[PDB]
Amino acid sequence: MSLDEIEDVYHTRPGYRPEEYRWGQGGAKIIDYHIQSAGVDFPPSLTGNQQTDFLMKVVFEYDFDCVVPGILIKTLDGLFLYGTNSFLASEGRENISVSRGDVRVFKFSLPVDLNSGDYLLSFGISAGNPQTDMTPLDRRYDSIILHVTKSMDFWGVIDLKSSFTS
Amino acid sequence: MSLDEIEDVYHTRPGYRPEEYRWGQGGAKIIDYHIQSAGVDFPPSLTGNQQTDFLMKVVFEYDFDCVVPGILIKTLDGLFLYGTNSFLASEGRENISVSRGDVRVFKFSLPVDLNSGDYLLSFGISAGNPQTDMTPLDRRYDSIILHVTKSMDFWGVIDLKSSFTSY
Ligand SMILES: [Cl-]
Ligand SMILES: [Cl-]
Ligand SMILES: [Cl-]
Ligand code: NA
Ligand code: NA
Ligand code: NA
Ligand code: NA
Ligand code: NA
DSSP states (O other): OOOOOOOGGGGTTTTTTTTTTEEOOOOEEEEEEEEEEEEEEESSSSSSEEEEEEEEEEEESSEEEEEEEEEEEEEEOOOEEEEEEEHHOOOSSSOOOOOOOOOOEEEEEEOOOBEEEEEEEEEEEEEEEETTTTEEEEEEEEEEEEOOOSSSSSSSSSSSOOOOOO | OOOOOOOGGGGSSSSTTTEEEEEEOSEEEEEEEEEEEEESSSSSEETTTTTEEEEEEEEESEHHHHHHHHEEEEEEEEEEEEEEEEHTTTTTOOOEEOTTTTTEEEEEEEOBBBBBBBEEEEEEEEEEETTTTTOOOEEEEEEEEEEEEOOOOOOSBBBBOEEEEEE
Protein backbone atom coordinates (compact mmCIF):
# COMPACT_ATOMS: atom_id res chain seq x y z
CA MET A 1 0.00 0.00 0.00
CA SER A 2 1.13 3.55 -0.84
CA LEU A 3 1.11 6.32 1.79
CA ASP A 4 0.92 8.97 -0.95
CA GLU A 5 -2.48 7.74 -2.24
CA ILE A 6 -5.71 8.66 -0.41
CA GLU A 7 -8.33 7.07 -2.69
CA ASP A 8 -10.68 4.66 -0.93
CA VAL A 9 -9.71 1.48 -2.79
CA TYR A 10 -10.56 -0.92 0.05
CA HIS A 11 -13.52 -2.33 -1.90
CA THR A 12 -11.19 -3.43 -4.76
CA ARG A 13 -9.09 -5.89 -2.76
CA PRO A 14 -9.20 -9.68 -2.61
CA GLY A 15 -11.64 -10.93 0.02
CA TYR A 16 -13.65 -7.73 0.20
CA ARG A 17 -17.30 -8.27 1.11
CA PRO A 18 -19.92 -6.02 -0.46
CA GLU A 19 -21.99 -7.15 2.56
CA GLU A 20 -19.80 -4.95 4.80
CA TYR A 21 -21.55 -2.72 7.31
CA ARG A 22 -19.50 0.48 7.36
CA TRP A 23 -20.23 3.21 9.89
CA GLY A 24 -18.43 5.88 11.88
CA GLN A 25 -18.52 9.49 12.94
CA GLY A 26 -16.02 10.69 10.31
CA GLY A 27 -12.76 12.63 10.58
CA ALA A 28 -10.68 9.69 9.36
CA LYS A 29 -11.20 7.01 6.71
CA ILE A 30 -9.88 3.46 6.40
CA ILE A 31 -9.05 3.60 2.69
CA ASP A 32 -7.20 0.34 2.02
CA TYR A 33 -6.07 -2.95 3.49
CA HIS A 34 -3.50 -5.60 2.81
CA ILE A 35 -3.16 -9.21 4.02
CA GLN A 36 0.06 -11.20 3.57
CA SER A 37 1.61 -14.41 4.78
CA ALA A 38 4.64 -16.54 3.88
CA GLY A 39 5.65 -14.29 0.98
CA VAL A 40 2.22 -14.06 -0.64
CA ASP A 41 0.13 -10.95 -1.03
CA PHE A 42 -3.55 -11.75 -0.41
CA PRO A 43 -3.13 -15.51 0.08
CA PRO A 44 -6.34 -17.28 -0.85
CA SER A 45 -6.32 -19.16 2.42
CA LEU A 46 -4.73 -18.56 5.79
CA THR A 47 -3.29 -21.18 8.13
CA GLY A 48 -1.77 -21.62 11.54
CA ASN A 49 1.84 -22.00 12.70
CA GLN A 50 3.03 -19.05 10.68
CA GLN A 51 2.43 -15.34 10.93
CA THR A 52 -0.17 -13.46 8.92
CA ASP A 53 -0.04 -9.66 8.72
CA PHE A 54 -3.30 -7.70 8.61
CA LEU A 55 -2.63 -4.13 7.47
CA MET A 56 -5.02 -1.18 7.29
CA LYS A 57 -4.35 2.24 5.79
CA VAL A 58 -6.01 5.34 7.22
CA VAL A 59 -6.13 8.97 6.19
CA PHE A 60 -6.76 11.47 9.00
CA GLU A 61 -8.62 14.71 8.37
CA TYR A 62 -7.76 16.41 11.72
CA ASP A 63 -4.99 16.45 14.28
CA PHE A 64 -5.60 13.85 17.01
CA ASP A 65 -3.44 13.21 20.09
CA CYS A 66 -4.57 9.58 20.32
CA VAL A 67 -5.61 7.18 17.59
CA VAL A 68 -6.51 3.53 18.20
CA PRO A 69 -6.85 1.08 15.30
CA GLY A 70 -8.60 -2.22 15.91
CA ILE A 71 -9.37 -5.59 14.42
CA LEU A 72 -12.17 -8.09 14.98
CA ILE A 73 -12.59 -11.71 13.80
CA LYS A 74 -15.98 -13.41 13.96
CA THR A 75 -17.37 -16.77 12.85
CA LEU A 76 -19.34 -16.71 9.63
CA ASP A 77 -22.54 -16.93 11.74
CA GLY A 78 -21.53 -13.88 13.80
CA LEU A 79 -19.92 -15.22 16.99
CA PHE A 80 -17.22 -12.83 18.30
CA LEU A 81 -13.98 -14.79 18.42
CA TYR A 82 -11.20 -12.25 18.84
CA GLY A 83 -10.91 -8.51 18.79
CA THR A 84 -8.05 -6.30 19.83
CA ASN A 85 -6.67 -2.83 19.30
CA SER A 86 -3.44 -0.90 19.60
CA PHE A 87 -4.09 -0.09 23.33
CA LEU A 88 -4.40 -3.85 24.14
CA ALA A 89 -1.87 -5.27 21.65
CA SER A 90 1.03 -2.80 21.75
CA GLU A 91 4.07 -3.52 23.86
CA GLY A 92 4.54 0.21 24.47
CA ARG A 93 1.95 2.40 26.14
CA GLU A 94 2.50 5.62 24.16
CA ASN A 95 -0.39 7.27 22.30
CA ILE A 96 -0.22 7.22 18.50
CA SER A 97 -0.66 10.87 17.47
CA VAL A 98 -1.46 12.18 14.00
CA SER A 99 -1.67 15.45 12.13
CA ARG A 100 -4.30 16.60 9.68
CA GLY A 101 -3.69 14.98 6.30
CA ASP A 102 -1.51 12.17 7.64
CA VAL A 103 -1.76 8.72 6.04
CA ARG A 104 -0.74 5.83 8.28
CA VAL A 105 -0.56 2.07 8.02
CA PHE A 106 -1.33 -0.11 11.06
CA LYS A 107 -0.26 -3.74 11.17
CA PHE A 108 -1.64 -6.54 13.32
CA SER A 109 0.43 -9.75 13.10
CA LEU A 110 -0.78 -13.07 14.46
CA PRO A 111 -0.79 -16.79 13.68
CA VAL A 112 -4.19 -17.77 12.37
CA ASP A 113 -4.46 -20.89 14.55
CA LEU A 114 -8.17 -21.35 13.80
CA ASN A 115 -9.93 -24.47 12.65
CA SER A 116 -10.68 -24.70 8.94
CA GLY A 117 -13.61 -22.58 7.82
CA ASP A 118 -14.65 -19.08 6.86
CA TYR A 119 -14.37 -16.11 9.20
CA LEU A 120 -15.33 -12.47 9.04
CA LEU A 121 -12.74 -9.71 9.52
CA SER A 122 -13.35 -6.10 10.55
CA PHE A 123 -11.05 -3.09 10.82
CA GLY A 124 -11.80 0.09 12.78
CA ILE A 125 -10.22 3.37 13.76
CA SER A 126 -11.03 5.57 16.78
CA ALA A 127 -9.46 8.87 17.79
CA GLY A 128 -9.54 11.55 20.46
CA ASN A 129 -7.65 13.16 23.32
CA PRO A 130 -6.87 12.20 26.92
CA GLN A 131 -8.73 15.29 28.18
CA THR A 132 -11.88 14.50 26.16
CA ASP A 133 -12.75 11.01 24.89
CA MET A 134 -12.25 8.48 22.10
CA THR A 135 -14.72 8.22 19.20
CA PRO A 136 -15.14 5.66 16.37
CA LEU A 137 -14.28 7.48 13.17
CA ASP A 138 -14.58 4.66 10.62
CA ARG A 139 -15.52 1.03 11.17
CA ARG A 140 -15.58 -1.46 8.32
CA TYR A 141 -17.47 -4.31 9.92
CA ASP A 142 -17.56 -7.82 8.48
CA SER A 143 -15.86 -6.32 5.44
CA ILE A 144 -13.40 -9.09 4.54
CA ILE A 145 -13.86 -12.87 4.25
CA LEU A 146 -11.05 -15.09 5.50
CA HIS A 147 -10.74 -18.71 4.33
CA VAL A 148 -8.75 -20.84 6.76
CA THR A 149 -7.22 -24.22 6.01
CA LYS A 150 -5.57 -25.64 9.13
CA SER A 151 -2.04 -27.01 8.95
CA MET A 152 -2.06 -28.94 12.22
CA ASP A 153 -4.42 -31.60 13.51
CA PHE A 154 -6.62 -30.42 16.38
CA TRP A 155 -10.27 -30.07 17.20
CA GLY A 156 -12.34 -27.05 18.21
CA VAL A 157 -12.15 -23.49 17.00
CA ILE A 158 -8.62 -22.65 18.25
CA ASP A 159 -5.39 -24.67 18.30
CA LEU A 160 -4.13 -24.19 21.88
CA LYS A 161 -1.01 -26.22 20.98
CA SER A 162 -0.94 -28.56 23.95
CA SER A 163 2.13 -30.59 24.75
CA PHE A 164 1.70 -34.15 25.96
CA THR A 165 3.75 -36.21 28.43
CA SER A 166 3.40 -39.72 29.80
CA MET B 1 -1.09 -38.28 42.43
CA SER B 2 -0.08 -41.66 43.87
CA LEU B 3 0.38 -44.54 41.40
CA ASP B 4 -0.14 -46.97 44.30
CA GLU B 5 -3.76 -45.84 44.87
CA ILE B 6 -6.63 -46.93 42.62
CA GLU B 7 -9.70 -45.43 44.38
CA ASP B 8 -11.87 -43.23 42.13
CA VAL B 9 -11.38 -39.90 43.95
CA TYR B 10 -11.93 -37.69 40.87
CA HIS B 11 -15.22 -36.40 42.26
CA THR B 12 -13.46 -35.02 45.38
CA ARG B 13 -11.17 -32.54 43.61
CA PRO B 14 -11.48 -28.78 43.20
CA GLY B 15 -13.55 -27.81 40.16
CA TYR B 16 -15.29 -31.18 39.84
CA ARG B 17 -18.77 -30.89 38.34
CA PRO B 18 -21.50 -33.21 39.60
CA GLU B 19 -23.12 -32.32 36.24
CA GLU B 20 -20.51 -34.46 34.46
CA TYR B 21 -21.68 -36.90 31.84
CA ARG B 22 -19.49 -39.96 32.31
CA TRP B 23 -19.67 -42.64 29.63
CA GLY B 24 -17.56 -45.37 28.04
CA GLN B 25 -17.26 -49.09 27.39
CA GLY B 26 -15.13 -49.78 30.46
CA GLY B 27 -11.77 -51.50 30.72
CA ALA B 28 -10.05 -48.49 32.29
CA LYS B 29 -11.08 -45.77 34.73
CA ILE B 30 -9.94 -42.18 35.05
CA ILE B 31 -9.68 -42.17 38.86
CA ASP B 32 -8.11 -38.77 39.62
CA TYR B 33 -6.96 -35.49 38.11
CA HIS B 34 -4.73 -32.60 39.00
CA ILE B 35 -4.44 -29.05 37.68
CA GLN B 36 -1.43 -26.82 38.30
CA SER B 37 -0.21 -23.54 36.90
CA ALA B 38 2.94 -21.52 37.71
CA GLY B 39 3.66 -24.14 40.36
CA VAL B 40 0.37 -23.52 42.18
CA ASP B 41 -1.74 -26.63 42.74
CA PHE B 42 -5.49 -26.27 42.05
CA PRO B 43 -5.39 -22.47 41.73
CA PRO B 44 -8.85 -20.86 42.03
CA SER B 45 -8.56 -19.60 38.45
CA LEU B 46 -6.25 -19.79 35.46
CA THR B 47 -4.55 -16.58 34.25
CA GLY B 48 -5.23 -15.83 30.59
CA ASN B 49 -2.26 -16.91 28.39
CA GLN B 50 -0.51 -18.78 31.18
CA GLN B 51 0.83 -22.35 30.73
CA THR B 52 -1.34 -24.80 32.73
CA ASP B 53 -0.83 -28.51 33.35
CA PHE B 54 -3.87 -30.78 33.16
CA LEU B 55 -3.09 -34.25 34.57
CA MET B 56 -5.26 -37.35 34.63
CA LYS B 57 -4.62 -40.66 36.43
CA VAL B 58 -5.94 -43.89 34.92
CA VAL B 59 -6.10 -47.51 36.10
CA PHE B 60 -6.21 -50.14 33.33
CA GLU B 61 -8.17 -53.37 33.80
CA TYR B 62 -6.72 -55.11 30.70
CA ASP B 63 -3.60 -55.06 28.52
CA PHE B 64 -3.88 -52.52 25.68
CA ASP B 65 -1.38 -51.92 22.85
CA CYS B 66 -2.30 -48.26 22.22
CA VAL B 67 -4.06 -46.09 24.81
CA VAL B 68 -5.01 -42.55 23.91
CA PRO B 69 -5.85 -39.99 26.60
CA GLY B 70 -7.57 -36.80 25.52
CA ILE B 71 -9.06 -33.50 26.56
CA LEU B 72 -11.93 -31.23 25.43
CA ILE B 73 -12.51 -27.58 26.41
CA LYS B 74 -15.87 -25.92 25.76
CA THR B 75 -17.72 -22.75 26.72
CA LEU B 76 -20.83 -22.96 28.95
CA ASP B 77 -23.11 -22.56 25.90
CA GLY B 78 -21.44 -25.50 24.15
CA LEU B 79 -18.94 -23.87 21.81
CA PHE B 80 -16.17 -26.39 21.24
CA LEU B 81 -12.98 -24.42 21.83
CA TYR B 82 -10.22 -27.04 21.71
CA GLY B 83 -9.76 -30.77 21.75
CA THR B 84 -6.83 -33.08 21.35
CA ASN B 85 -5.42 -36.39 22.40
CA SER B 86 -1.98 -37.92 22.89
CA PHE B 87 -1.70 -38.86 19.23
CA LEU B 88 -2.75 -35.49 17.79
CA ALA B 89 -0.96 -33.31 20.36
CA SER B 90 2.32 -35.13 19.81
CA GLU B 91 1.94 -35.23 16.01
CA GLY B 92 2.10 -39.02 16.11
CA ARG B 93 5.15 -39.29 18.40
CA GLU B 94 3.41 -40.98 21.33
CA ASN B 95 2.38 -44.61 21.39
CA ILE B 96 1.43 -45.85 24.84
CA SER B 97 1.02 -49.52 25.79
CA VAL B 98 -0.18 -50.72 29.18
CA SER B 99 -0.60 -53.96 31.09
CA ARG B 100 -3.55 -55.12 33.19
CA GLY B 101 -3.43 -53.39 36.58
CA ASP B 102 -1.20 -50.54 35.46
CA VAL B 103 -1.76 -47.04 36.87
CA ARG B 104 -0.55 -44.18 34.65
CA VAL B 105 -0.61 -40.41 34.72
CA PHE B 106 -0.93 -38.34 31.55
CA LYS B 107 -0.26 -34.63 31.28
CA PHE B 108 -1.51 -32.05 28.76
CA SER B 109 0.23 -28.68 29.15
CA LEU B 110 -1.11 -25.67 27.29
CA PRO B 111 -1.40 -21.90 27.47
CA VAL B 112 -4.93 -21.01 28.45
CA ASP B 113 -5.38 -18.49 25.58
CA LEU B 114 -9.02 -17.68 26.50
CA ASN B 115 -10.88 -14.60 27.67
CA SER B 116 -12.11 -14.17 31.25
CA GLY B 117 -14.99 -16.51 32.04
CA ASP B 118 -15.93 -20.12 32.85
CA TYR B 119 -15.17 -23.15 30.69
CA LEU B 120 -15.87 -26.87 30.77
CA LEU B 121 -13.08 -29.44 30.70
CA SER B 122 -13.33 -33.14 29.79
CA PHE B 123 -10.76 -35.88 30.32
CA GLY B 124 -11.07 -39.16 28.38
CA ILE B 125 -9.19 -42.43 27.84
CA SER B 126 -9.64 -44.60 24.74
CA ALA B 127 -7.75 -47.43 23.08
CA GLY B 128 -7.02 -48.64 19.56
CA ASN B 129 -6.10 -46.99 16.25
CA PRO B 130 -6.84 -43.25 16.77
CA GLN B 131 -7.81 -42.45 13.17
CA THR B 132 -10.12 -45.36 12.47
CA ASP B 133 -10.89 -47.73 15.37
CA MET B 134 -10.80 -46.39 18.91
CA THR B 135 -12.85 -47.72 21.76
CA PRO B 136 -13.85 -45.15 24.40
CA LEU B 137 -12.98 -46.66 27.79
CA ASP B 138 -13.86 -43.91 30.28
CA ARG B 139 -14.93 -40.44 29.12
CA ARG B 140 -15.53 -37.82 31.82
CA TYR B 141 -17.31 -35.28 29.68
CA ASP B 142 -17.83 -31.71 30.94
CA SER B 143 -16.60 -32.91 34.30
CA ILE B 144 -14.50 -29.97 35.51
CA ILE B 145 -15.24 -26.22 35.62
CA LEU B 146 -12.36 -23.86 34.83
CA HIS B 147 -12.34 -20.16 35.75
CA VAL B 148 -10.11 -17.82 33.71
CA THR B 149 -9.07 -14.40 34.97
CA LYS B 150 -7.42 -11.40 33.26
CA SER B 151 -6.95 -7.69 34.01
CA MET B 152 -8.06 -6.39 30.59
CA ASP B 153 -10.42 -8.46 28.47
CA PHE B 154 -10.18 -8.43 24.68
CA TRP B 155 -13.37 -8.89 22.58
CA GLY B 156 -14.55 -12.42 22.15
CA VAL B 157 -13.51 -15.70 23.59
CA ILE B 158 -10.17 -16.84 22.16
CA ASP B 159 -6.88 -15.00 22.39
CA LEU B 160 -4.97 -15.00 19.09
CA LYS B 161 -2.21 -12.89 20.73
CA SER B 162 -1.73 -10.32 18.01
CA SER B 163 1.29 -8.04 17.92
CA PHE B 164 0.96 -4.49 16.65
CA THR B 165 3.09 -1.96 14.79
CA SER B 166 2.42 1.29 12.95
CA TYR B 167 4.05 2.97 9.97
CL1 LIG C 1 4.09 -32.89 22.76
CL1 LIG D 1 7.71 -33.97 18.87
CL1 LIG E 1 -14.21 -37.13 27.16
NA1 NA F 1 -25.02 3.16 10.38
NA1 NA G 1 -15.63 -9.21 12.01
NA1 NA H 1 -2.85 -28.98 19.38
NA1 NA I 1 -24.28 -42.94 28.24
NA1 NA J 1 -4.46 -10.35 22.32
